[PDB]
Scaffold this active site. Structure first.
Site, PDB file in Angstrom:
ATOM      1  N   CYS A 161       0.639  -0.694   0.062  1.00 22.40           N
ATOM      2  CA  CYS A 161       0.152  -0.065   0.504  1.00 22.40           C
ATOM      3  C   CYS A 161       0.922   1.056  -0.030  1.00 22.40           C
ATOM      4  CB  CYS A 161      -0.673  -0.221   1.528  1.00 22.40           C
ATOM      5  SG  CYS A 161      -1.746   1.533   0.924  1.00 22.40           S
ATOM      6  N   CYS A 220      -0.283   4.727   2.279  1.00 28.16           N
ATOM      7  CA  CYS A 220      -0.358   3.514   3.521  1.00 28.16           C
ATOM      8  C   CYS A 220       1.334   4.175   4.232  1.00 28.16           C
ATOM      9  CB  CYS A 220       0.005   2.042   3.941  1.00 28.16           C
ATOM     10  SG  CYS A 220      -1.931   1.718   3.456  1.00 28.16           S
TER      11      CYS A 220
END
Length: 121
Positions: free
Chosen positions: A46, A49
């Site tokens: 991700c 993220c």
């Protein structure tokens, strides 16, 4: 015979970001008292993220009366993840008194900061 966490352990993690797993998550949340807990649910693939990581750490340094944790939503933690109810990453869960009281989806650090202020009251 299981382990129980206490003041000792909570004092040791405030101001920092701690990565937990499906086995250490609840023992920490349960030892949190009425202090809000924020959980950053991410995956190793991700992008947003990882990009949010340094901002999340900044938040953890500013708010010492809030516990900041992170959970890699992989195979070994599939259980806890499903139990917290996740449809997307990144997802932030705010808990208070063993219950989820808020949720922010996406890297909306601004909405996250709002939810954190709200939980503190």
């Amino acid at each position: 015979l299981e382990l129980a966490l206490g003041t000792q352990e909570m004092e040791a993690i405030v101001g920092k970001v701690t990565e937990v797993n499906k086995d250490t998550f609840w023992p920490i949340v349960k030892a949190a008292g009425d202090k809000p807990v924020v959980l950053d649910m991410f995956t190793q693939w991700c992008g947003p993220c990882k990009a949010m990581a340094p901002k999340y750490e900044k938040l953890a340094e500013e708010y010492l009366d809030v516990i900041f944790l992170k959970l890699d939503c992989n195979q070994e933690n599939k259980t806890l993840a499903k139990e917290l109810g996740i449809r997307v990453v990144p997802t932030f869960k705010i808990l208070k008194e063993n219950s989820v009281v808020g949720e922010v989806t996406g890297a909306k650090y601004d909405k996250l900061l709002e939810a954190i202020q709200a939980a503190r009251s």
